[PDB]
Symmetry: D2
Subunit: 335 residues, 4 copies
């Protein structure tokens, strides 16, 4: 299958075109530490043949968590435990990525110091974020840098910056959530400033021969918000510094979105073609047939699976046509 073709990014070779999409498991301690549940969860998909396993949103600071059972990477105790996930996944043949995250105004922890670019709620049930000063923005940029340094020490192959799903970076990017009148707002180049700064600081702390991905929401589905043309502008500002755009949509504010298989694929194809950068497609993809169409029609370079890999962790194994492709221990099960 075309799904089985390796993809080389910098010095990292992904053995096939399937990525496990980052999915929060809400299973960490309030200290943000992974446990044996995480280790088995990720190892299972590495055994299952996934080319690139993207770890769930991992907070760069405690107020950057979505919930108080999220993983974090703000200290060295977390690194020692995250290293266990990395080691077992790579031992079992996967490339290991980490999604560095900051929930911003969508932090749902009742007692946290919730922050954002502008004092506007994400929805009725959320807290009003306090407006970051330029000095505080600098400190969060530094936090993404330190997190990337820690991720390198844990042994991750790939780092992904979470700039999507209505979280902190997305809030700076959208005119609907960013009403600032300083150097971080108004003009498109100013709205991009925080993302650009984060990518720059991550590069200072991440080996030049390892890939950097960025996950984006390519559409807010609202007048005045991000749309595909606006996202193309942003990607053109950063594409010389990053390796692949992980293409998603939505999340800034509640909107009724038409859901169907491949509902985000046109965004992935548009970014790939107009920006000439690698992309990954994600969103209600469950069949080998659709994954093959996406890759063969050059709509994306990687196909990411989320919920399908929750219920069907050996999905990739099922696609193999020879028993020699299976884990040696399971080759008697090839059918």
């Amino acid at each position: 299958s075309i799904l089985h073709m390796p993809l080389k990014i910098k010095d990292i070779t992904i053995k096939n075109r399937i990525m496990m999409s980052p999915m929060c498991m809400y299973s960490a301690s309030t200290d943000g530490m992974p446990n044996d549940w995480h280790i088995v969860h990720y190892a299972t998909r590495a055994i299952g043949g996934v080319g690139l396993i993207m770890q769930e949103a991992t907070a760069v600071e405690s107020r950057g968590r979505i919930t108080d059972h999220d993983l974090g990477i703000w200290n060295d105790e977390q690194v020692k435990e995250l290293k266990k996930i990395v080691d077992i996944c790579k031992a079992n043949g996967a490339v290991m990525g980490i999604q560095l995250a900051h929930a911003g105004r969508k932090c749902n922890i009742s007692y946290e110091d919730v922050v954002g670019p502008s004092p506007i709620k994400a929805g009725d049930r959320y807290k009003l974020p306090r407006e970051l000063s330029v000095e505080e923005i600098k400190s969060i940029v530094k936090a993404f840098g330190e997190a990337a340094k820690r991720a390198n020490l844990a042994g991750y192959d790939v780092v992904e910056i979470h700039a999507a799903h209505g979280y902190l970076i997305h809030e700076f990017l959208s005119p609907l959530s960013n009403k600032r009148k300083d150097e971080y707002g108004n003009s498109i180049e100013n709205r991009a400033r925080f993302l650009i700064e984060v990518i720059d600081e991550v590069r200072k702390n991440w080996p030049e021969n390892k890939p950097i991905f960025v996950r984006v929401s390519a559409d807010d589905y609202m007048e005045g918000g991000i749309n595909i043309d606006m996202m193309v502008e942003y990607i053109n500002m950063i594409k010389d510094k990053v390796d692949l755009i992980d293409v998603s949509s939505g999340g800034l504010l509640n909107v009724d979105i038409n859901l169907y298989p491949g509902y985000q694929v046109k965004y992935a194809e548009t970014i790939k073609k107009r920006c000439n950068i690698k992309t990954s497609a994600v969103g209600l993809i469950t069949t080998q047939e659709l994954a093959e169409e996406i890759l063969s029609n050059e709509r994306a370079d990687l196909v990411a699976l989320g919920r399908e890999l929750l219920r069907n962790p050996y999905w990739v194994l099922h696609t193999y046509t020879s028993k020699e492709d299976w884990p040696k221990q399971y080759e008697r099960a090839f059918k």
Copy 2:
């Protein structure tokens, strides 16, 4: 979108699935259908297909591919073809007919094999006799007569077969059309035969019933049809027809990279650049891919060929309530 109706002129198709035309090579040498064809098509109507497109049906006996093809070249064929129409409509499908002429790909040894230019389609083929302008006009008349017969048989939709290397395709492609008269040697002249066929069909087909055209959007060869050229042709005809059934290949032997949805980009390009309805076909087998194609607006209909041969009740399996099933089979709903 899969279960959403599509109205085209006065005809409403109840869902977006079309049974792609597929030759069954089961007729007599007289081109008459039999019980085999009746059951074959009825089965997919029972299976819930929205639009059943009958296999290539020859407008002249020399326009057959084989001597077991269906024909509509004479009035005697109408009463037999009517049996197919009646049973499919009774069982809930819209019925279409693909009007066809095999041209230089006619594989009947004893027939009068014709084409635009005296060039073989391949080694095993007969050299075609080069058509005169008078003979071209006779073939155009034959398409018109076929459309009149189709209307009398009760078909809802007529598709002109302009693809797969057969007669009309042969006029369209520079690789097979070396004519230097009004039917060759410029893009407008190469489209002339198709345009004249469409015009004559329109004179013999009710204005409130749709006309589809199936095209090959790529010859996969330097010098031949490519997507840009097909866009030019579709722009010439789009005010006179209702939907472009998008396919590819057939003119000359070529290697083509095959994968699910390998002709879908052609269907999307035509739909967008020409602002016309299109149908997509080729190695689509899953509800998932069909839904993505329709919902990302890459086509207006999804055609299934081989999947409906092996899995005739494919549409029924997509329904979420027993009330959508044939009443007789209600107790089998999952």
Copy 3:
């Protein structure tokens, strides 16, 4: 597959071990005539590779219909129409069977002459049946004989006598519905008398070289009714005169039955072994896997599929391992 092995019964060779279980389509005229709907319905499963197609319950008298949209074979005019179904199925490679039926007290037609062995309703919604006289029983016996003569003229390969599902013959067989004190009731030999007479009359009118099947209900699931021991006794009385027992259960009176895949298979195996007769198994079998287990473990000689063949008419084709096994017209579709 073992499913693919032929079975010869008398002069008739069934090409595989799959039977389409008889299923009423309630699509006939009030005159009991089939139409194009029946012809397509049965031909589809012949095209689908079914070895033996058993036509739905076909009434031997108009008062023996379940509904007034049932097929009939009570007059010579029905023959030439039924012959259309026979001819198309055989042309497409199937052996064609007909189930000769008489609804007895379960006749649901309000205006019909509803008859039974004893004046006891099948349930609250049914008509009180008229108690048959010995002379009337003789006429119904004659009707089955005339039906078998008609079936032979239509060209059916196999006749099945419907002695199950709470209908007329079953009513004579069960002590719960047969309270007669004449030669047709009040001992096991007397309760079998009607079935035996029907079989003898059918044989008088059915060529010796064509099989006779009998469908039975092997359990009433009620104290005092038929159970497997009683059915073994009945089959022992008829085994020298019939070729295969099509094994079912229930139908006499409303009862809660525990339903699951193969819930009637034990009865088919028990009759097969205890009576040394061929049997067919039916009931909630949908997978090639279960069908193969049944045949390979010698629990039955034929596997009957009902509802599965309604939803999945080409089930048998899907089991084939080669394109040349498929109808020639569909060979390009082999996957």
Copy 4:
């Protein structure tokens, strides 16, 4: 019945699916498990398996099949095996261990290979030393010590591997047991080793935890074990053990007709003739067949081997509500 609990002594299995024991050939030469085993078994616990039976675990180093097998012949292996037990129980499964001794089928060329009679398992195998009565006593002791260790590790169920051509099966079969002492000749004598092992395991295994025994109910060879012989053996042990895990073959190479449920008739026969619980195994892959076996009362448990290797969440796929899934995966219910 599939989702119905089964209580055996004080142990409640939440459903009727057992992961059949399957060697992974991934341990150290010291018989130690590693993170590979922990993930392997944990995955099927997450997958909803009721009873996970750990692969053949050797009660002596010379009782391994290969030098990458798990061992339980020393106290140091206990702490490591406990990691498997703990994670499987935490994730909702009952944990079993198959206690094993390969006998003449030990495939370690340098090991002290032993059997009841000096006869090779095949040309590639080492000639086994014929066990003395005193050495037999010591192996019985080794099974007892293994069970004590298993209890310490926290296993819920112990299974004695008396099948597949290994040590106990070798005593059981006239084809492999040519002894003329108290452990050979008569049926009672051939059963003596198995009976002594069971007694010793019970001395070392809490009275409120169950003991299973896996058997080969047929050698498929004249003069070997057949179902009638196995029924007599089971009748000898049924008052001491809780369930018979029914398999076949393994003593010598033989051709066996393979199909779904090919060992199910052995399971049913033992269950009916001996009035003991049984488990069925062998080419069962569908929910449909598993349900038929359980509901027709042919066995009490259904064991899946190769199906759980390729499809570890098989049980989850049988659930009808999202609440039956691990909380973390609820959004993936379909």
